[PDB]
Ligand binder design. Structure first.
Ligand SMILES: Cc1cc2nc3c(=O)[nH]c(=O)nc-3n(C[C@H](O)[C@H](O)[C@H](O)COP(=O)(O)OP(=O)(O)OC[C@H]3O[C@@H](n4cnc5c(N)ncnc54)[C@H](O)[C@@H]3O)c2cc1C
Ligand SMILES: NC(=O)C1=CN([C@@H]2O[C@H](COP(=O)(O)OP(=O)(O)OC[C@H]3O[C@@H](n4cnc5c(N)ncnc54)[C@H](OP(=O)(O)O)[C@@H]3O)[C@@H](O)[C@H]2O)C=CC1
Ligand SMILES: NC(=O)C1=CN([C@@H]2O[C@H](COP(=O)(O)OP(=O)(O)OC[C@H]3O[C@@H](n4cnc5c(N)ncnc54)[C@H](OP(=O)(O)O)[C@@H]3O)[C@@H](O)[C@H]2O)C=CC1
Ligand code: SF4
Ligand code: SF4
Ligand code: SF4
Ligand code: SF4
Ligand code: SF4
Ligand code: SF4
Ligand code: FES
Ligand code: FES
Lengths: 1172, 117, 118
């Protein structure tokens, strides 16, 4: 004891002996890199990233393999450790092939996750797609409408056909969620700081949006009547609607940002005023000057700049154009001026440019649309002089150029030859370019081109407390460049306001440049969704929109075409985390070799990529030591070491369980699990903790979802052991099934017709009343499924009581295990937590195949486990076992005073002979001090369970800690179903149906009619209600079907097979409208029983169910067991009437006949296994 | 009966009326739970709208035997979703609207043959 | 390491080596009487109120002086422990002089704390 205390990295910490230094440092928030360390298995020592320096040791020690001692001094951030980790990471990055991020995202200036929201649209989740888009910009509809999309240039779908329409999808999502429920991001608590933003263009609005989300108070000073910047006063109305821009700015100003219009800084309000009154200042003034013609007579009346012209068009001012207008320039300003002039009644518009069409910096789409609308292009012509009389410009004398040598930028330089041409024009508009003007703002340094000089990456001007960004710094660019600069400056300002200014730096990713068209030649080809463009006859006269937003069918069709280029493991990969932490270059030299694979492993569940393997060996170690399948292994030496299945066979031809533990321990993207959703994606999923709904083992899970789609399930390594199996890892895809029912249906004239919930409730209540009135008591059977929660089962029992019946049963429970007649409670006498302290485990049945996580736990515990032999499939062999145990000298007096009928049990074993193997098993069992018997309920009959109870009772190994019988139930809530009274055998139900006693049946979650005997039985009923998720075989035979929700949409509790009550939480909202508890509550309220919430039902459970005392305030986040919160049963005597174990004779029971699956979810999983 | 008047309509109308400021106290029988003198003392006026809630008997020999029940009581137990017993054959005595409602509700409640006397 | 786990009073608990059974039970909300135990000094063994029954031991052990081991079964509410604690408390109450509550409060029918508010 004495408080073992270590000193690491300067701090003094109190730890526990036996722990490694890695665990001890991580418990106290000290981060040490590791790749090959798992705390549940032995150390390996492959990566070497966990090296620390320990005083008294000449060489670096691996903190994953050294246990803590008392008073040892550890340093983790020295020069030697950092050098070793950087060298190791460089060597690892020397061998890695993959795309951390897709080409589309890396081509975007703002690094928007294009793959993420494209793949979220492909899943039908649009609010999530908008939430993903809004992490980078505040105005996605305008940007999606007007972006020149560099992302679509880099799209890899271009190697198959034309690429994905990323901007159109973004505009669709943004407008759909503007016209519906508007999304407001969460905001940090107020910090008490003040930031003044000058200008309300894209940069200023983005900086204000991202500083308000940090908790600061932002005020925007705009010189114009309305916000938007050049998006409002330079973008024409037919390309960008101003209603969209106004609606977005209103959404932003709802968040608490104040915008003050008609306030020009330096002309109306000084910058010193803002410097004194605010904690920071950001300058997003933009470039709001127009370049002149730079020719003779450029100052004459009749010549006006393009920016000024567009501004007067926007403000609905009085302009003069004339019949003929000459636009000088070739960029987007010239295109906008020319097309606005065509709409403003100019009869002929001509564009004067000094180069060719292919040399123009304008977009080809804009040029094509302009040519369609009617503007003529005059090429390779440079203006020289403006001619006019009486001060009114009337002609443009220009020089004729010729193509010359390319410049440094890759464009040919025009050269005059000898020729001039004079063009007649009423108006001459110079759309030559833009220049930044600082105006009257003083003490701000500017470049020779007018741009504000800032410190690169810190966005700081010469004046303190003042920052700059946008077109004021970079000059004229596209809008997403301004948005990116605004967001980066917002981050830098936010860091500065906390007292430590850090500059913005780009991140390092692994990228692939070897992808060619031949590598994608197996992809099918699907044509792009073309844009609906209005005819050019009506476009030339109106300022109406020239294109339409995508519909939902078009958006789904376009989004389902993505190739999913980026790594799915990016948000959880540990290689890229350390690569970016230690700043290792991911660039590759061509003179070194990385192994490239042509792998073909089309396993339906597990994907293996040897190109992304760091050879930590965690997968083979887990599959060997934990699972025990040993389906994969190492092959080779040195560089040629590769992990692959047995004999290089496919993973489907080997002993794989498809558990997915190799996926769960992998630190990189070498092992991934397959997609549960319609199209999986790399995303930060939301996680909800629940329990598995397939086995009685009750493994804890984390459901990872995004909106209303469940994407994956991971083990819960914090609250449990962190293991799963195939049904728990991959079994929650039925939540995403499109074949699930949505509304109740009633059979009229032999057709199912949809009804409302009230009509369905009235119909089922009245029909049950009709059956009771015609046929009296006990004419209704209630058959439930043991997959429902405890509250659902309690309400089903109440419903059975309300319609005057005692036949409550289940096809899966089928009467219990028979342990209740012997001991008193039909439950296991010990918990799973006591499996580690036994010195002998006797396994009866196929525990490994049915409940494999239990076998994982038993194997990792390391105790001696002996399986019951398969050649002893007769009960007479068990009687020989009892005789051999009795001949080994048990205490007859204690078992005589504690049991009933031990004398007859001794008499019936009088002439029983004992074989050699039976003697060996009995000696092994009776020798051990604390043995456990683990009985698998699926493959073991009731008499074998009774005989194991007899052995444990007569030996004396029951009713104590680490000694007794563990019984593993078939379904998740079989224990809860047994506790609520669903213990009637189904032979009684079949006999009552065929004898005319039972006329109606209520089936909840089961499918008995998949087999012909029960189907012909159900054909003789009078009425049948089926509560199920799918329209299965039984629901087709019903007179009424009511839908049920999946386990990812329910709140409740499940009782484990070791009597532990666990909380089940709802990941996603119910897709049918109502949950099962609500349906049962409404029906019971119709029948006359009043419950309101689940708390009332839990109080009723605690008051009525005998052994569940304490469920009202149990706090199921901790461990709750129902008998007095006790792990061990019968510590004070058995639960029978006389407090004695009832030992009675058992007949000769032949070899077991395998049981059937009646739950619809189980058979859905089984049938879907064959589909892949 | 429910097939002629939906109770959802009646509940919605009464909710509309109780939005106006009228308090309705259920499960309170005047004279059995609360005296009429109490209401006389505590209120400025009292209105009695108790209705006619008894059923006439058969006025015949053996009318008190088990297996004979009144129409109003039968309809009330049908409405409250209580446990009733009908049998295959049911004889309804009467010719008014009570007899029609009883006979048609009996046809819906699984009676194989209903005859009106 | 290996998760030292004991089983006391029917429950299974995970504890740390070197701790006494008294500390281990009190960490998990199990109340065992004690009068002469201080966790910062050595055990004494005077009162004897901390006696529990441990499997494998013929006589009651003092939980203030026995450290936890792996997989030991402890009961604190048996007949023997309750009898021993009641006898010890009777012998202690055989020698105690004092007023737990003043005469003024014990004479009040509602047992109002007269000394307290006075
Ligand atoms: C004609 C034209 C067409 C364009 N078309 C496209 C296109 O199709 N696609 C695309 O992606 N990009 C396009 N752009 C580019 C895009 O509009 C800009 O690059 C982007 O809006 C830059 O915005 P900003 O925040 O840097 O500054 P701006 O939005 O230009 O201006 C910010 C604000 O600062 C205010 N301001 C200026 N001086 C002061 C002062 N002294 N005090 C207070 N406030 C002040 C102004 O009123 C303005 O509202 C176009 C640009 C122009 C000119
Ligand atoms: N922010 C934006 O939206 C972008 C701007 N534009 C265009 O560029 C302008 C401003 O940006 P930027 O490209 O830096 O501006 P520039 O100064 O490069 O001018 C751009 C256009 O004008 C031509 N030009 C420039 N000076 C003269 C002169 N004395 N005589 C004749 N032609 C000239 C250029 O052709 P050349 O090809 O020979 O250089 C090009 O057509 C905008 O007004 C617009 O017309 C276009 C795309 C993006
Ligand atoms: N409020 C309502 O909705 C109205 C009531 N009803 C019927 O009338 C009943 C109560 O109203 P009211 O008309 O004043 O009641 P009555 O006392 O007049 O009885 C009405 C019905 O019962 C018959 N009847 C009465 N006494 C006997 C008896 N000893 N033997 C056989 N048949 C008998 C009547 O037929 P006869 O024609 O020979 O009088 C008639 O069918 C209701 O139960 C209902 O059956 C019908 C219409 C309106
Ligand atoms: S903002 Fe522009 S570059 Fe970025 S994803 Fe959208 S269309 Fe592509
Ligand atoms: S195919 Fe999909 S993931 Fe690949 S670049 Fe195009 S949009 Fe991005
Ligand atoms: S496994 Fe990790 S490092 Fe490798 S490409 Fe994927 S995210 Fe990047
Ligand atoms: S596949 Fe994954 S777990 Fe296995 S060695 Fe490679 S990186 Fe490690
Ligand atoms: S899924 Fe399980 S059994 Fe299959 S290779 Fe991975 S760890 Fe081994
Ligand atoms: S062992 Fe049973 S409870 Fe655990 S994950 Fe597998 S099916 Fe689910
Ligand atoms: S060498 Fe210790 S974590 Fe890899
Ligand atoms: S506390 Fe007194 S003997 Fe242990």
């Amino acid at each position: 004891m004495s408080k073992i205390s270590i000193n690491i990295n300067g701090r003094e910490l109190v730890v526990s002996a036996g722990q490694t230094i890695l665990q001890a440092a991580a418990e106290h928030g000290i981060e040490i890199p590791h790749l090959c360390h798992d705390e549940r298995i032995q150390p390996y020592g492959a990566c070497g990233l966990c090296v620390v320096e320990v005083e008294g040791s000449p060489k670096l020690v691996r903190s994953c393999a050294t246990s803590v001692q008392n008073g040892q001094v550890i340093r983790t951030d020295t020069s030697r450790t950092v050098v070793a980790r950087k060298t190791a990471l460089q060597l690892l990055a020397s061998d890695h092939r993959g795309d951390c991020r897709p080409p589309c995202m890396l081509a975007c200036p703002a690094q928007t996750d294009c793959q993420g929201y494209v793949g979220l649209i492909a899943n039908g989740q649009y609010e999530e797609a908008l939430k993903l888009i809004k992490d980078k910009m505040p105005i996605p509809a305008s940007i999606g409408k007007i972006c020149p999309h560099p992302c679509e240039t880099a799209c890899r779908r271009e190697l198959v056909e034309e690429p994905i329409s990323i901007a159109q999808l973004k505009s669709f999502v943004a407008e759909v969620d503007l016209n519906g429920n508007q999304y407001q991001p969460p905001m940090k608590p107020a910090t008490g700081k003040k930031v003044a933003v000058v200008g309300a263009g894209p940069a200023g609005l983005t900086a204000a949006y991202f500083l308000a989300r940090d908790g600061h108070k932002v005020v925007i000073y705009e010189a114009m009547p309305h916000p938007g910047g050049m998006l409002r006063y330079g973008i024409p109305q037919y390309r960008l609607d101003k209603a969209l821009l106004d609606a977005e700015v209103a959404l932003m100003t709802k968040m608490g940002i104040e915008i003050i219009y008609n306030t020009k800084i330096g002309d109306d309000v000084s910058l010193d005023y803002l410097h004194d009154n605010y904690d920071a200042v950001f300058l997003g003034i933009g470039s709001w000057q127009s370049q002149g013609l730079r020719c003779k007579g450029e100052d004459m009346e009749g010549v006006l700049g393009g920016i000024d012209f567009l501004r007067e068009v926007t403000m609905n001012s009085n302009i003069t154009l004339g019949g003929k207008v000459l636009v000088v320039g070739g960029g987007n300003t010239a295109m906008d001026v020319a097309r606005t002039s065509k709409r403003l009644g100019a009869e002929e518009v001509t564009i004067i440019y000094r180069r060719t069409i292919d040399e123009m910096p304008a977009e080809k789409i804009e040029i094509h649309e302009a040519q369609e609308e009617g503007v003529k292009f005059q090429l390779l012509v440079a203006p020289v002089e403006v001619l006019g009389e009486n001060g009114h410009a009337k002609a443009l004398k220009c020089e004729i150029m010729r193509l010359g040598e390319p410049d440094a930028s890759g464009r040919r330089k025009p050269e005059p030859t000898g020729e001039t041409v004079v063009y007649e024009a009423d108006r001459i508009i110079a759309a030559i370019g833009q220049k930044t003007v600082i105006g009257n703002i003083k003490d701000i340094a500017t470049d020779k081109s007018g741009n504000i000089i800032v410190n690169g990456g810190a966005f700081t001007t010469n004046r303190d407390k003042v920052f700059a960004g946008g077109d004021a710094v970079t000059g004229p660019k596209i809008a997403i460049d301004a948005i990116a600069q605004g967001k980066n400056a917002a981050q830098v300002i936010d860091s500065y306001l906390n007292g430590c200014l850090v500059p913005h730096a780009d991140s390092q990713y692994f990228t692939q440049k070897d992808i060619t068209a031949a590598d994608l030649a197996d992809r099918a080809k699907a044509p792009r969704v073309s844009l609906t463009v209005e005819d050019a006859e009506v476009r030339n006269k109106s300022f109406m929109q020239v294109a339409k937003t995508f519909t939902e069918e078009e958006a789904l069709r376009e989004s389902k075409r993505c190739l999913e280029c980026g790594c799915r493991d990016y948000f959880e990969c540990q290689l890229i985390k350390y690569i970016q932490d230690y700043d290792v270059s991911t660039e590759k030299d061509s003179q070194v070799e990385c192994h490239k694979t042509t792998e073909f492993d089309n396993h339906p569940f597990i994907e293996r990529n040897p190109d992304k393997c760091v050879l930590c060996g965690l997968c083979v170690r887990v599959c060997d030591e934990v699972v025990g399948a040993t389906a994969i292994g190492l092959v080779g030496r040195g560089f040629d070491s590769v992990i692959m299945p047995e004999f290089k066979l496919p993973l489907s031809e080997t002993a794989c369980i498809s558990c997915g533990q190799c996926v769960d321990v992998c630190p990189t993207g070498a092992c991934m699990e397959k997609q549960v959703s319609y199209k999986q994606i790399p995303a930060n999923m939301d996680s909800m903790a629940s329990v598995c709904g397939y086995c009685g083992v009750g493994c804890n899970v984390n459901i990872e979802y995004k909106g209303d789609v469940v994407f994956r399930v991971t083990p819960d390594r914090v609250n449990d052991d962190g293991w799963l199996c195939q049904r728990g890892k991959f079994g929650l895809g039925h939540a995403n099934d499109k074949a699930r029912l949505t509304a109740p249906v009633i059979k009229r004239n032999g057709q199912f017709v949809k009804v409302d919930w009230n009509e369905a409730n009235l119909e089922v209540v009245k029909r049950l009343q009709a059956v009771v009135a015609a046929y009296g008591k006990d004419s209704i059977g209630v058959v439930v499924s043991p997959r429902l929660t405890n509250e659902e089962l309690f309400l089903a029992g109440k419903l059975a009581d309300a319609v005057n019946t005692t036949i409550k049963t289940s096809y899966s429970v089928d009467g219990g295990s028979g342990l209740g007649s012997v001991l008193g409670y039909d439950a296991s006498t010990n918990s799973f937590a006591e499996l580690d302290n036994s010195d002998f485990v006797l396994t009866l049945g196929k525990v490994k195949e049915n409940h494999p996580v239990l076998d994982f736990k038993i194997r990792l515990s390391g105790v001696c486990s002996v399986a019951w032999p398969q050649s002893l499939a007769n009960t007479a062999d068990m009687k020989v076992f009892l005789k051999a145990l009795l001949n080994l000298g048990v205490d007859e007096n204690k078992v005589a005073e504690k049991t009933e009928g031990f004398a007859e049990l001794k008499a019936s074993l009088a002439d029983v002979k004992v074989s050699e193997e039976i003697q060996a098993l009995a000696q092994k069992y009776a020798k051990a001090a604390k043995p456990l018997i683990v009985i698998d309920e699926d493959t073991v009959s009731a008499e074998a369970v009774k005989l194991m109870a007899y052995a444990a009772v007569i030996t004396g190994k029951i009713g104590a800690a680490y000694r007794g019988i563990i019984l593993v139930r078939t379904k998740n809530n079989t224990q809860g179903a047994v506790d609520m009274g669903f213990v009637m055998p189904v032979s009684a139900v079949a006999q009552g149906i065929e004898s005319g006693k039972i006329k109606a049946l209520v089936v909840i979650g089961e499918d008995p009619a998949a087999y012909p005997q029960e189907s012909a039985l159900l054909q003789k009923l009078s009425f049948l209600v089926v509560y199920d998720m799918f329209m299965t075989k039984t629901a087709t035979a019903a007179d009424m079907v009511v839908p049920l929700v999946s386990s990812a949409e329910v709140n409740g509790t499940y009782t484990r097979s070791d009597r532990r009550i666990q909380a089940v939480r709802a990941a996603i909202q119910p897709k049918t409208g109502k949950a099962t508890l609500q349906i049962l509550i409404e029906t019971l309220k119709s029948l006359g029983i009043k419950y309101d919430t689940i708390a009332d039902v839990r109080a009723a459970i605690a008051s009525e169910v005998s052994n569940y005392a304490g469920m009202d305030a149990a706090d199921f986040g901790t461990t709750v067991y129902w008998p007095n919160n006790k792990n061990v049963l019968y510590t004070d005597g058995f639960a029978t009437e006389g407090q004695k174990a009832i030992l009675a004779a058992v007949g000769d029971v032949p070899v077991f006949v395998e049981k059937k699956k009646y739950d619809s979810v189980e058979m859905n999983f089984v049938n879907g296994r064959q589909s892949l």
